[PDB]
Amino acid sequence: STLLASLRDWLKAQQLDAVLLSSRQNKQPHLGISTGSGYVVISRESAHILVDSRYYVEVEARAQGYQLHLLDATNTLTTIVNQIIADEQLQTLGFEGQQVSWETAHRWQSELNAKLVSATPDVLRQIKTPEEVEKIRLACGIADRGAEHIRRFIQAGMSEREIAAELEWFMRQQGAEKASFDTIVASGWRGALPHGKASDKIVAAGEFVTLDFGALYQGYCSDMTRTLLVNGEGVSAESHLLFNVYQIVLQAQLAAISAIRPGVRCQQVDDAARRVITEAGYGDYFGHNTGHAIGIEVHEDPRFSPRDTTTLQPGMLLTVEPGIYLPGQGGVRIEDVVLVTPQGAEVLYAMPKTVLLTGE
Amino acid sequence: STLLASLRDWLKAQQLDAVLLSSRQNKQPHLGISTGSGYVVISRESAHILVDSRYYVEVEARAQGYQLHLLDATNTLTTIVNQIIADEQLQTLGFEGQQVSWETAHRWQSELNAKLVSATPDVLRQIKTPEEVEKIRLACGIADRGAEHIRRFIQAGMSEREIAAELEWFMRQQGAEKASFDTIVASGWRGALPHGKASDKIVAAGEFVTLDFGALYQGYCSDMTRTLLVNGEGVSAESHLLFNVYQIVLQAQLAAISAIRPGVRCQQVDDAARRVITEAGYGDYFGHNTGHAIGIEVHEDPRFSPRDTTTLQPGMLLTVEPGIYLPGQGGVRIEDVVLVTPQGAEVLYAMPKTVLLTGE
Ligand SMILES: C[As](C)(=O)[O-]
Ligand SMILES: C[As](C)(=O)[O-]
Ligand code: NA
Ligand SMILES: [Zn+2]
Ligand SMILES: [Zn+2]
Ligand SMILES: [Zn+2]
Ligand SMILES: [Zn+2]
């Protein structure tokens, strides 16, 4: 209803009669599941769901408000959509040109009785509805508890991968469908790798270990990073080589978060965090964006980047995750998911972002 | 290398001067890793790898036989490939039209100084090399032990989500990188959902519970289904509501395996399973294919489906997974990964497929 109204408004604004939704992320709200298979066709007057025998009985429960079509040998996308084009005399038909393969679009371009136009409805997902925000909250909540669990769990001698397995297992136990992306556990020198997926490297005492991870909860994602200190005998934060670097990052993260409220454009938030790191003399060791939107996918638009001029509004959720990465020494990243509120910004993680020790 | 020769034989047969490989699965044999980023360019005369700083040092070391190019701001897909097109006067360039989006292929066709032709090298992967067969053989092993473990682990009272967490965790602990796909755990009435991903539903005594799951091991996939009987007081197989249905499924599964040997068309294997299920009076509740090939991906070609006329060859690996799904009652599926052998067929799982009780 609200989902369908929002889509139809988009159709009119875009000069389109209907849209063929094929991407899993844009099909999920309608299907109640995330699948590569199946299609959703939305017209100004009707709503259709197309699935094969593998998903029919499962979708059928949730699919109130939709016309339900079985995909089989005789009944295909072509036969079904063409029937729909006929009944409502549809002239123009949208498709996700960034999600559909050249081959599939090309067959469509020849087989579909309408003018096919590459359009993307991804922009509608920028502002979340309360039901979505709530789902993301529990995703974020599941993540938040995982951080604490994994902090008590970590022992010098363990592998980065074991830590990830344990962390994911715990998230799963907390109701997660799975991790929202391949878990990053980057200890010691691997901390210099912003994308250091958990490896067989042994975690050692006195090392920083960066955990970047997240939960998929009912089709919505969380995304968190904490850089912890692997505890051992005579280990202290202030003695660490990268202690100042840690603080510079934590500060840059706060500087970006305090800069978030409705109305502020995205590039200014990156400017906030980046200038702190840059005037600290580490501008060249901050190679990625300050953050990214999040929702049905881990990475959505807009971006906290130097070039993104998108203006901020309540209902948006974005990550704030600056970092400094020093090849040969290690690195630090600290990430929060931030919900934009009418008043300002709201952090959905309770986990402290100071230097914490593992174990005990 | 045989890999490059086989590709070059394919190039010749396809009448293409070169191919641009972009999909993670078709790059993996060349890169030794699985990434969305990066490209592999093979001509009749040369072999190239294009990766960014994240993978360059590790790939450049291992990737002997290739010309290595760094991807950065200055050196891009366009600048690098166009140089190669120039140096060897390439006329035609194949690209994976089923993996590259409509938008991306359009951009490439204009930015690249050659005629791009949608071609797909996926067929070279149908027959596995002894190295590949072994890796899959071991991937299957991890799943096989996981099934044995999870069967003893399951107790009435657990949720499907909980059972999945343990099964996934155990696979990791057994050396798996991760699950090859989202784990299906469908107990009682949810057993009527062929893709019923593990939910919060409690598994109850006397329920059938279907576990469909798999491991990603060394870049290759396993895929297994077992339907177990949840143990409880006075619970017995023969008394179960779906016992006959279970037996019909098991029978159809064996009949399909028995049909597998070099020379047989894939549709004939499907015919074997479907005829058993159909003659039993349950054809209308067996809506999906009998199986699929598996390798770098969980789903590959050919398919054990009514229409696939592909003839079986030694070194191919396919699943055999017929099922019967009864809305309101439950369902049964039994899945093996089967290696086509020189003489006939070999099942790579040791787990029994008769009705097994959980626990103890
Ligand atoms: C590793 As990320 C950009 O999903 O926080
Ligand atoms: C659930 As399957 C088609 O990957 O066995
Ligand atoms: Na061209
Ligand atoms: Zn993250
Ligand atoms: Zn992030
Ligand atoms: Zn399968
Ligand atoms: Zn399966």
Curated annotation (Swiss-Prot), chains A, B:
Per the record, the domain of life is: Bacteria
Organism expressing this protein natively? Escherichia coli (strain K12)
Taxonomic lineage of this organism? Bacteria, Pseudomonadati, Pseudomonadota, Gammaproteobacteria, Enterobacterales
Its needed co-factors are: Co(2+); Mn(2+); Ni(2+)
> Mind telling me which PANTHER family this protein's record contains?
AMINOPEPTIDASE, AMINOPEPTIDASE YPDF
Q: Which residues cross the membrane?
A: none
Gene3D superfamilies associated with the record? Creatinase/methionine aminopeptidase superfamily, Creatinase/prolidase N-terminal domain
Q: Which family does it belong to?
A: Belongs to the peptidase M24 family.
Q: What does this protein do?
A: Hydrolyzes the N-terminal methionine when the next amino acid is alanine, proline or serine. The substrate preference for methionyl aminopeptidase activity is Pro > Ala > Ser. Also able to hydrolyze the Xaa-Pro peptide bond when the first amino acid is alanine, asparagine or methionine.
Which UniProt keywords are listed? Aminopeptidase, Hydrolase, Protease
What EC number(s) is this enzyme filed under? 3.4.11.-
Question: What protein name is recorded for this chain?
Answer: Aminopeptidase YpdF
Q: Which molecular-function annotations from GO does this UniProt entry contain?
A: aminopeptidase activity; metalloaminopeptidase activity; protein homodimerization activity; transition metal ion binding
**Pfam families assigned to the protein according to its UniProt record, in alphabetical order:** Creatinase_N, Peptidase_M24
List, alphabetically, the CDD domains matched. APP-like (cd01092)
Q: Name one GO biological process term.
A: proteolysis
Q: Which enzyme class? A: hydrolase
For this chain's record, the cofactor binding note is:
Co(2+), Mn(2+) or Ni(2+).
